[PDB]
């Protein structure tokens, strides 16, 4: 499977095992649950652009050992 690296503001680099065919929608929501917060509370940034729920690793140009950033939305979700 493809492994993406999640970079947090607390200076952390978590490994994220994603499947090339699975909608990022599922990956995003399930990761929020692992964090302990509801979805839409955090925004996933890839190359500066926010990863939409209706996106897949096939597009954008996601590769192995990639870097994905996560920040908290102003609304809080």
């Amino acid at each position: 499977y493809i492994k993406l690296k999640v970079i947090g503001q607390d200076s952390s680099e978590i490994h994220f095992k994603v499947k090339m065919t699975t909608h990022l929608k599922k990956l995003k929501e399930s990761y929020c649950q692992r964090q302990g917060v509801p979805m839409n509370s955090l925004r996933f940034l890839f190359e500066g652009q926010r990863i939409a729920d209706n996106h897949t690793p096939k597009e954008l140009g996601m590769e192995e050992e990639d870097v994905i950033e996560v920040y908290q939305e102003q609304t809080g979700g």
Binding site: H15, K17, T22, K26
Partner: peptide, 14 residues
């Protein structure tokens, strides 16, 4: 090593 978030549709772990 850092833990890898297993969310790949393969094993029932969701």
């Amino acid at each position: 090593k850092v833990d890898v978030i297993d969310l790949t549709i393969e094993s029932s772990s969701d």
